[PDB]
Write a protein that binds this ligand. Structure first.
Ligand SMILES: *[C@@H]1O[C@H](CO)[C@@H](O[C@@H]2O[C@H](CO)[C@@H](O[C@@H]3O[C@H](CO)[C@@H](O)[C@H](O)[C@@H]3O)[C@H](O)[C@H]2NC(C)=O)[C@H](O)[C@H]1NC(C)=O
Ligand code: NAG
Ligand code: NAG
Length: 309
């Protein structure tokens, strides 16, 4: 189900969250397993102080991790407070898209103000469909200058206000710069898994120097600059590559047996065929699979009736 299944939850101010100022200790659990937010998210200081007027205890920082399943927010994301023990927004490390159909002050779709974080860490963020971005007053925040926000924007006129964060020179002098394996499009943090996009190729969500084409385990092939694992029936080749693509039909050399174009662990024994009959096969000396005698309804080890005594 592509990780967590698609679960749409209401934003702050709608439905079960009507008349709520902020994500807070009472309502955070109602975002459990949400993947899309129909509305806005607000995270304010009160969330972490507690609020006696609304019978709200202080929010436990660990529970912010409940937001790790959020992939989409259709409105805006406003973060004006964050736990002191958290150097980034890894709660939102899986957020992919902010659509910005509603905007703070009718302007901003992402706003990150007055935090102590040292990086943003929105490592999955790829699109801010509409609305401006504001990142200001984050006195320890680096890396924000490196993003080419145009790669995320999809509307004319979108703009960033990135100001009063840690100084550029200061960030460079303390080594807070994009990893060498990042492309020039910038980064969300110092790690190779924080790149907006890769210099060379990626493996999962990490940027790397090269796929395992001729050495290394497991062997891989390159699919649109991504390292994709080779099928395990493909025998690794000391000289050659091992695959031309995915599946057991794209091996250079099969590892166990050969059923036509398929490399396979064991010759088929009972699979379904084109007919009211099951397909039974056996392996010869050269580990090629061959149909068994038709009268061999429970399989075979060699050709002929002798194969099914
Ligand atoms: C923290 O989150 C909780 C839950 O999301 C918020 O609690 C909600 O607070 C509002 C008032 O602030 C309550 O709304 C009122 O409900 C009554 C009774 O149904 C209704 O007659 C009023 O018209 C109004 O809608 C709501 O019941 C309450 N819900 C729960 C589950 O407690 C809380 O306010 C949030 N606090 C902060 C500081 O963000
Ligand atoms: C999502 O919810 C299911 C139960 O509804 C739970 O088993 C699973 O652990 C949850 N996902 C995470 C990441 O906790
Ligand atoms: C990765 O890309 C950089 C920049 O184009 C290049 O200098 C380097 O040789 C590349 N390495 C590999 C393994 O492709």
């Amino acid at each position: 189900c592509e990780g967590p299944c698609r679960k749409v939850c209401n934003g702050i101010g709608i439905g079960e969250f009507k008349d709520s100022l902020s994500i807070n200790a009472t309502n955070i659990k109602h975002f459990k397993n949400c993947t899309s937010i129909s509305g806005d998210l607000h995270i304010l200081p009160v969330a972490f102080r507690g609020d006696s007027f609304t019978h709200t205890p202080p929010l436990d920082p660990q529970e912010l991790d409940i937001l790790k399943t959020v992939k989409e927010i259709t409105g805006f994301l406003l973060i004006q407070a964050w736990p002191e023990n958290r150097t980034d927004l890894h709660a939102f490390e899986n957020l992919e898209i902010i659509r910005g159909r509603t905007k703070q002050h009718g302007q901003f779709s992402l706003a990150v103000v007055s935090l102590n974080i040292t990086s943003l860490g929105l490592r999955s963020l790829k699109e801010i469909s509409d609305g401006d971005v504001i990142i200001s007053g984050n006195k320890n925040l680096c890396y924000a200058n490196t993003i080419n926000w145009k790669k995320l924007f999809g509307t004319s006129g979108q703009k960033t206000k990135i100001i009063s964060n840690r100084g550029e020179n200061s960030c460079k002098a303390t080594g807070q710069v994009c990893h060498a394996l990042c492309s020039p499009e910038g980064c969300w943090g110092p790690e190779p898994r924080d790149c907006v996009s890769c210099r060379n190729v990626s493996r999962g969500r990490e940027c790397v120097d090269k796929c395992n084409l001729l050495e290394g385990e497991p062997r891989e092939f390159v699919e649109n600059s991504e390292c994709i694992q080779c099928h395990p029936e493909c025998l690794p080749q000391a000289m050659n590559i091992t695959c031309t693509g995915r599946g057991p039909d794209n091996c250079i050399q099969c590892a166990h047996y050969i059923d036509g174009p398929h490399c396979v662990k064991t010759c088929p024994a009972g699979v379904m065929g084109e007919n009211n009959t099951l397909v039974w096969k056996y392996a010869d000396a050269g580990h090629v699979c061959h149909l068994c005698h038709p009268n061999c309804t429970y399989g075979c080890t060699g050709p002929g009736l002798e194969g099914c005594p």
